[PDB]
Design a protein around this ligand. Structure first.
Ligand SMILES: Nc1ncnc2c1ncn2[C@@H]1O[C@H](COP(=O)(O)OP(=O)(O)O)[C@@H](O)[C@H]1O
Ligand SMILES: Nc1ncnc2c1ncn2[C@@H]1O[C@H](COP(=O)(O)OP(=O)(O)O)[C@@H](O)[C@H]1O
Ligand SMILES: [Mg+2]
Ligand SMILES: [Mg+2]
Lengths: 419, 213, 206
């Protein structure tokens, strides 16, 4: 009866539900087709069908209501919306539309929206008066996000080190510089666990580009939030389509005084798809990357803002270096000074089986006074003074043992005061 | 009624002004489009509309009156000036033009300047006799700019050190060599505070390239 | 059966000749309509004639006229098509008063060469052309009208100053698009608008 709950059901249960209804031969077909078939048969009974999803607008003028469960993949079960409804209710790409859907008549292959009663988890009339996102005035981050977890007390010190190396706030536009095989994937997973635990109210969204199918499944099971990803076998145009879907959805949520945190992986992979999709302008720069090709990633990355009126958009991205490619190096160079917090990883530290492989000297943040307190800020400065003479590798094992025998960061801070 | 005061108004107030006028669906759109829509509706009443900005000339020959509020960004609310008006009043890129603007007729998407009554905060006839900047003879700096602030008495000694390390005068062509993460941004901010305080008469302009929003 | 449906649908005077009737009957009725219209125009009245079809009308005229001893391409004599030219050219706007409006249909791609020669001589004789496309009709999109090919002369007198400029803006957008993609683009825009004025102000937004 309800579209959202039907997709969340297991595929094995989905076949059983359709068999007793009256349908046949639903076992050996894609799950998306099964949902369309079940809704088609259930529509004959005359009962109302509820549907919801993320709305996008095509270039022709009509739009479809994509579902975040299938990573915004086009399917027969997508809800079609006429352009006339767009005039009645001001809608743009990214917003969530929920309402009743009518059975598709002959000649059309998609369900049509009948009546909308919920826009962006709010009344449709109220959503019409929301101020656009681009008109909002950005500000520096001021809401400290405690990345350290005390109740878990796990053997991993990544959360404790991350706060000391570079505090993360709401609306940050930081990037992660991670060489290959340096624990980049687990670094994002640990951050996601703390966000889902310390700040359950904040909306957490994870976007992955050119990731293996088994890596996507593990991310969904581990991260307690909305995870959308595109596999490598999918075309480069699919990567562009999903990338714009995530940011547009986040912007609409920010307009409703909500905080959205986006874990991006990766800018280099994202810029790879953007360069291929954009047509050639007749001029090729160094590395085969056009000037206008990297304009799109700049728009996506720069959207991380702290709204003065209310809410914030936090974007955390990963940058790949020393991958043996030049294009990936040119992409990194233009994305150096665009961030608010840099987190540089070192392959050599990972070669010593010491984790997390974080370069404390290279890592840093801007305007850390607003995030931390007066007492906390001074303690961090004292720690950096001791670390700076030490090398990038010797600093980690020095910090790891100190944090290993201390319960919280406060206990570590008062220990350094003794010396 | 006046273009300059309308852009300085908050976006929240801008929507409310257009709603009572008669316009609709102004909330979910860019601020630049809202200003154009409000002026378009207000133009139907027949009341005169005042506009001003910085004039630039394109390569084709026509120009537009950019606004410094939007960082000179191209928009539908930019005032279009015909090349004929350029011959009547010698104008080049950079000068400020203020005057009445007529409603855009069918076929054009930009407002057109009707009559100009203020050029560079001066009478247009007087601005025509000004000498160009390139014919002026440069000289060394001779007007001392006191960068030190006494009334504030803040804990920061940057203003006091700057005067001792290197005095700054009017017409200086100095440069700052700043490594990354060396307080370069706050260095310019402290200088700006002293200039706006010690010398309010002097015009202060700040230009930033490739900076975060 | 087509004649009977036309009489029931059209609220006016409908006259037609069936295929079984001889070609001389087609000529007799064709001259009857135009001569009747001319007399009404002389009385300060406006007459509108819907002709269907010039190719069919020229077919009967060619057979009725006796052969002059010379046959041109397609078996159509030069004097044979003189009569349709007189009938079609009678559409005039009288300065003193009244007017005669003639709207005709031309058949193309019918598999006959003769029907092609007739169309060629009747290309530049019209004041407005309305070209239909079979490919558009194959897509189940109606009306199958080629917007780029269609046009009119001296449209300034008919439309107003404000209306004329809006049409020019629309043609600028349509021209880059193909003859088929232009229709579905126009159909959806007109579908959600009440009148053409509402459609015109919508295009002004872009
Ligand atoms: N916090 C951590 N603690 C212990 N081991 C880690 C940690 N993070 C990563 N690793 C090690 O890194 C390996 C996986 O690295 P990977 O995520 O593939 O690096 P990259 O993402 O740079 O390719 C695992 O075998 C794991 O043992
Ligand atoms: N005059 C000053 N007094 C105290 N601290 C300062 C001063 N100028 C800069 N800082 C410190 O520098 C940091 C910001 O440096 P930043 O402006 O980012 O350097 P850069 O512009 O070279 O990148 C702040 O955390 C601030 O504490
Ligand atoms: Mg990885
Ligand atoms: Mg700086």
């Amino acid at each position: 009866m309800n579209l959202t709950e039907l997709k969340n059901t297991p595929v094995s249960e989905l076949i059983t539900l359709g068999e007793n209804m009256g349908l046949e031969n639903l076992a050996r077909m894609r799950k998306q087709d099964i949902i369309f078939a079940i809704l088609k048969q259930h529509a004959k009974s005359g009962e109302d069908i509820f549907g919801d999803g993320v709305l996008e607008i095509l270039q022709d003028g009509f739009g479809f209501l994509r579902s975040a469960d299938s990573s915004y993949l086009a399917g027969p079960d997508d809800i079609y919306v006429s352009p006339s409804q767009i005039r009645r209710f001001n809608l743009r790409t990214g917003d969530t539309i929920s309402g009743k859907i009518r059975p598709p008549k002959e000649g059309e292959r998609y369900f049509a929206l009948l009546k909308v009663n919920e826009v962006n988890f709010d009344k449709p009339e109220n959503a019409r008066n929301k101020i656009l996102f681009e008109n909002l005035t950005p500000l520096h981050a001021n809401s400290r996000l405690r990345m350290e977890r005390g109740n878990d007390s796990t053997e991993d010190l990544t959360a404790r080190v991350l706060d000391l190396a570079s505090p993360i706030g709401r609306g940050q536009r930081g990037l992660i510089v991670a060489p290959p095989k340096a624990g980049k994937t687990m670094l994002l997973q640990n951050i996601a666990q703390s966000i889902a635990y310390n700040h359950p109210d904040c909306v957490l969204m994870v976007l992955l580009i050119d990731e293996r199918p088994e890596e996507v499944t593990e991310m969904q099971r581990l991260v307690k939030g909305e995870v959308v990803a595109s596999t490598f076998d999918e075309p480069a145009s699919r990567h562009v389509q999903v990338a714009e879907m995530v940011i547009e959805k986040a912007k609409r949520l920010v307009e409703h005084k909500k905080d959205v945190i986006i874990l991006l992986d990766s800018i280099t992979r994202l810029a790879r798809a953007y360069n291929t999709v954009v047509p050639a302008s007749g001029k090729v720069l160094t590395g085969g990357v056009d000037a206008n090709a990297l304009h799109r990633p700049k728009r996506f990355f720069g959207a991380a803002r702290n709204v003065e009126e209310g809410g914030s958009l936090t974007i955390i991205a990963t940058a790949l270096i020393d991958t043996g490619s030049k294009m990936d190096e040119v992409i990194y160079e233009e994305f150096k000074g665009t961030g608010n917090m840099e987190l540089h990883l070192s392959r050599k530290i990972a070669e010593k089986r010491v984790f997390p492989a974080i370069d404390y000297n290279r890592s840093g943040t801007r305007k850390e006074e607003l995030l931390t307190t007066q007492e906390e800020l001074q303690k961090m400065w004292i720690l950096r003074k001791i670390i700076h003479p030490m090398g990038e590798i010797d600093a980690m094992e020095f910090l790891i043992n100190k944090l290993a025998m201390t319960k919280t960061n406060d206990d570590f801070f008062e220990m350094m005061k003794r010396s």
